[PDB]
């Protein structure tokens, strides 16, 4: 099982003066860190969010980001000044950074940047570059950001070395939470007819839900989207279009790893 580590940053710029930056960190589908604009420090959302880093190692790492948040805010504001009246507020910047882990000690790091909801910039190798589809005016910010050798070397170290090491540590410290097994609970309902089989409170995400009459699997079964619960579990519903009168005989069978063979069969 491969785990993707994600550092999701969202920055809003309403005008020349007003600005805010909020960050969230995910390991798989579980949140590990929170960093609100109001907060001066990065907050742990798990007891094991520090990973295998020592206190001295974390303070130094947080401080680097603390300076970055202030720096990033000023730099974007100055980059708008370089374009104006080419580009204008409101401006939304999104950053998706981190690394995906693989069997053994293999990994792949990424740093993806979005402008106004569109993916335009990435850090690749030793420099910043635009992706296919990006507008040409971005060549000036790219040339400016690449001139900063100090930022380049720092980002290279964060992606190549720091990310894999930190996640290898997170997987050890968070093994108990990452490998947790929460049992789903199911209930049935009907709407004007369409029958709905609700499944709630399961972890991990993979699940099998299907409407069945005995041993026959119904083809018209439509799975919804995986909806999250507040307690870090998942919710999913399956719908089936049927004629009125033939509701009797239909059952919802649910397979999940937590159940351990004993599938939840629910007749109507």
């Amino acid at each position: 099982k491969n785990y993707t580590f994600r550092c999701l940053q969202m920055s809003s710029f309403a005008n020349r003066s007003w600005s805010r930056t909020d960050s969230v960190v995910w390991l798989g589908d579980l949140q590990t860190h929170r960093w609100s604009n109001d907060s001066a420090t990065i907050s742990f959302t798990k007891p094991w969010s520090q990973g295998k880093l020592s206190n001295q190692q974390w303070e130094k790492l947080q401080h680097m980001f603390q300076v970055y948040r202030v720096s990033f805010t000023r730099d974007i504001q100055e980059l708008v000044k370089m374009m104006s009246p080419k580009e204008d507020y409101p401006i939304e910047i999104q950053l998706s950074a981190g690394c995906e882990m693989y069997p053994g000690n293999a990994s792949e790091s990424f740093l993806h940047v979005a402008f106004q909801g569109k993916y335009v910039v990435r850090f690749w190798g030793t420099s910043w570059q635009t992706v296919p589809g990006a507008p040409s005016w971005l060549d000036l910010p790219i040339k400016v950001l690449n001139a900063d050798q100090g930022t380049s070397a720092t980002v290279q170290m964060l992606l190549n070395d720091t990310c894999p090491l930190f996640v290898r540590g997170l997987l050890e410290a968070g093994k108990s939470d990452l490998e947790k097994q929460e049992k789903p609970v199911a209930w049935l309902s009907s709407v004007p007819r369409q029958l709905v089989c609700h499944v709630s409170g399961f972890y991990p995400k993979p699940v099998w839900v299907m409407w069945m009459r005995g041993d026959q699997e119904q083809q018209g079964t439509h799975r919804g989207d995986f909806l999250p619960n507040a307690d870090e579990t998942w919710y999913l519903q399956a719908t089936l279009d049927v004629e009125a009168g033939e509701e009797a005989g239909l059952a919802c069978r649910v397979k999940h790893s937590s159940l351990g063979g004993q599938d939840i069969i629910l007749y109507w």
Epitope: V67, V70, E78
Partner: T-cell receptor
Framework: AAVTQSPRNKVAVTGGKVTLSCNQT?????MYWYRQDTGHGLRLIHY???????EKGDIPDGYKASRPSQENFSLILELATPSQTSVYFC??????????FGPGTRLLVLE | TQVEQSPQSLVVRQGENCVLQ??????????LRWFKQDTGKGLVSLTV?????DKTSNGRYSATLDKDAKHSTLHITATLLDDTATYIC?????????????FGAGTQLIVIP
């Protein structure tokens, strides 16, 4: 990379119009205006990232900036005041952090 | 004033060595630059320090930088008359044009011939 300033020395009256010009033939996108006063370091007045663009610095009050072309960057004093008696340094640079400074302009505003 | 220089003024005899201190609170600290300015003249770049623990030299001028202590020294070996000048410390907060230069008030050196 060479930067020039005109005039090099100016004696003006209070209320008069003073225009401090700066020329740069290095094809630098970015130009900067500073003033030097005893007991202080150089302080940013105005700056520019390109033609037709001017940006407020740390102490912009009493000054207006003008950039009609890539090569010229002008600091304008519409209503000159004795408090604007200073040595004015112009600078230029490309994407890099290096700012190449001009020779400086002495200004005295008399009552 | 995030960049402070010591001493304010300095009187030294020809041939003698002198050290010039610079202390800053600029964040972040990309590079530190030492300028030489003659009474009247413009700003002449002597050296630029870039590393966490950096050391540079330019003939009779030599400089160190400690980014952990946020502190720099300018050593002038065997001072000549032409060293009579104001020496200015400058810290840049970026490695690009997005940076702002933070200037010190300067250190006034007088060399007795």
């Amino acid at each position: 990379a060479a930067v020039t300033q005109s005039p090099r020395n100016k004696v003006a009256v209070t209320g008069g119009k003073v225009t401090l010009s700066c020329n740069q033939t290095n094809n630098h996108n970015n130009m900067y205006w500073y003033r030097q006063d005893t007991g202080h370091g150089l302080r940013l007045i105005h700056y520019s990232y390109g033609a037709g663009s001017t940006e407020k610095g740390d102490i912009p009050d009493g000054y207006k900036a003008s950039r009609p072309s890539q090569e010229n960057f002008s600091l304008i004093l519409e209503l000159a005041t004795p408090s604007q008696t200073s040595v004015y340094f112009c600078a230029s640079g490309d994407e890099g952090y290096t700012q190449y400074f001009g020779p400086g302009t002495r200004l005295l505003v008399l009552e | 004033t995030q960049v402070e220089q010591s001493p304010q003024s300095l009187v030294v005899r020809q041939g003698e060595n002198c050290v010039l201190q610079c202390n800053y609170s600029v964040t972040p600290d990309n590079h530190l630059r030492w300028f030489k300015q003659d009474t009247g003249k413009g700003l002449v770049s002597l050296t630029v320090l870039v590393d966490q623990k950096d050391k540079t030299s330019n003939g009779r001028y030599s400089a160190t930088l400690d980014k952990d202590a946020k502190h720099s020294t300018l050593h002038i070996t065997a001072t000549l008359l032409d060293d009579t000048a104001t020496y200015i410390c400058v810290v840049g907060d970026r490695g690009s044009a997005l940076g702002r230069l933070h200037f010190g008030a300067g250190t006034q050196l007088i060399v007795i011939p």
